[model samples]
Target: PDDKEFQSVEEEMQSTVREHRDGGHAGGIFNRYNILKIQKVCNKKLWERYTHRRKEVSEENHNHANERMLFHGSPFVNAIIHKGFDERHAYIGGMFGAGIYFAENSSKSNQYVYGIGGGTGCPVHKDRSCYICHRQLLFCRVTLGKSFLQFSAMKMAHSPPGHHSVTGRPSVNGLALAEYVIYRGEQAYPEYLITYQIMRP
Candidate 1:
């Protein structure tokens, strides 16, 4: 018996991406789940791939980040379960907000650096708060272990094979991915792709 249920962490995270991206301004808040253990049970390879890509991008711009910032905050899960499903998993997602933690000069801080998906709409706070300071992407990568588990849920939803359709579509690049895709739910679904924005400011 699969302890993971439908719309589990994996399903919600996979299905939440929609067409309209809300950025940080959307004011949508969700509970974050720690699933580092599930990462082991699920796709190890995809996990490695995402980690590699993130590190590669980070390494490629290390020196350039001296005055700027490349914040990759914590990883979290988006837990959402729909009616009529038996699984232990929930939506898989995480937060990756970035901004200048420290600046060499006040004026120098005015410039923008590389950003994540939801950083634009970050609520007002201390100085330099306007810059990119929120989760950028809700990106995801699956392993062989996660394949069939996600596939079964797609079947029940009457969606295409290996596809997930959430009630509320999630967004990417701080914007909705597509209306017909996901994000029809009253609440936004999990986002896997980390929203990354490249800016010179």
Candidate 2:
């Protein structure tokens, strides 16, 4: 009975790997089981094929620079908004009523915000050197036995304040909408930067 149970479990594990390889489960079988150990159980050839397909998809993404910033809309989740303003707004606005929250009502998710990979930026602190300050794209990449995951949540807009506040639709820049923007000013450059930490549960 013990040997029979072990054989049953082994067969089930192999079946799960086969299903994952065929793209049978959208959320992925890994979500329900120990994915890392499951991968370890897969034959070398099967694992290689699975990872290679993923690599192909990522390489394909590099060709679409404009589309890279656009992410499909997902259900609402918590977010953190980080904005910077110069002298007047910082002191006067305090926490009472300042930063622009134009995308939607305080509660609704911003449908249009997307994710971008890697970019450069100026230093957040004035005292820091702007020249040396920079950023790189954040995205998931697997190399040999190692992998790195990084991404930036972003939004693009070019319309004047009134038009932007209500619609949250960004003006396409000739070809594509721009990446995230932040404004530093006294009362208002009227510009703002909002980043959300989203999840699909």
Candidate 3:
């Protein structure tokens, strides 16, 4: 590891912003025993914002990946991801969200914490009205810092051999989701957060 070649970082200082995902500066006051308790409150707020936005938009994409519309730059849609999971174990309720784009100098206590929404399988139908989400079932979009490469993968959900399949499960890790969202590689534009097109079938 000592021989690692020196390469310049994209920027000397990455900026940190506050959002529902990070749990804010005050989040550190809680003890480890109460960490999950505090995180639950954070996750609830994230879900509320996502659900409210779903009502405002009449034509939302039911499936993952798209080339047309992405829920970026909106009041409620800070971030989002459409995922499905198994019933035996919860995929994301344990934390606020995934740990993809956290600040490097973020408080050690809140480092890996994030906001999470239930998986998309609760309704099992993409076209269902927002009212269907009231059952406490999983369906939401999460926001976090994402790379261009991972976003590319999310956009290609329905593209090739076996990309689309609700029967299969997605990973519970938030960082993994971030990587998936921005994996477009050299083609991925670094200046902007990449978003795949949302398609309707």
Candidate 4:
């Protein structure tokens, strides 16, 4: 019936991201962002591809899908829904190399979500915080069945032995920002699309 309303999950996801951003400096204290829109993707074909892969990995990993709703900075959807994230799109050059990268925090992902406006001024709003800006990001339900904890950037064609993904090691290497990298397309399913704007103080 497609009767399902998605507001609850949308709010949940938004709060999770907002809270993560506010973690060390939280409580809407910085109040750096305002979410304008959120969407739950209804791509049936991509769903089919994802579930099939989930089944395969579940069997192999003894039923631990190890799934997470992580954020990706660019490509609204089609690149992943169809063509998929390729090395050519690896314009940022991989910290983990050639694989599709995802962020654990909204700030890291937001680095790529540029809104159409001058750095400081809003056309209609006198208040800079009320600036009209257009920025977007995607939440992919990623399968990290077996992850390789990586501390350094040594280019690799695939995850290390017996692993399916690479997780950026945090703290030790002075690397505070955490990112996730996967080599294959099907390991990720675009789940949500968020449109937002920054409310700078």
Give the winner by lDDT. 4
- lDDT per prediction? 0.25, 0.22, 0.22, 0.64
lDDT for predicted candidate 3 compared with the true structure:
0.22
What's the TM-score of every candidate structure? 0.21, 0.15, 0.18, 0.74
Candidate 2, poorest ten consecutive residues by summed lDDT: 137-146
Summarize candidate 1's per-residue lDDT along 80-165 as a digit string, tens digits: 11111112222322121111111111111112221233334344442223333443323222111111122111213222343222
What lDDT is obtained when candidate 2 is compared to the true structure? 0.22
Per-residue lDDT of candidate 3, residues 70-162 (tens digit): 111211122222211112222222222121122222122122222122223123443211222212111113221212222111323221232
Candidate 1 error regions (>4 Å): 1-130, 142-201
Number of the predicted model whose TM-score against the real structure is largest? 4
Poorest stretch of ten by lDDT in candidate 4:
21-30
Better of 1 and 3 by TM-score: 1
Off by over 4 Å in 4: 1-30, 75-78, 81-88, 114-131
Model 2 lDDT tens row, 59-128: 5445221111111111111121122122222222211122222211111112112211111212253211
Clashes of each: 57, 7, 28, 1
Please, what are the lDDT tens digits per residue for candidate 4 over residues 14-56? 4545333324221112235576777777788878877888777
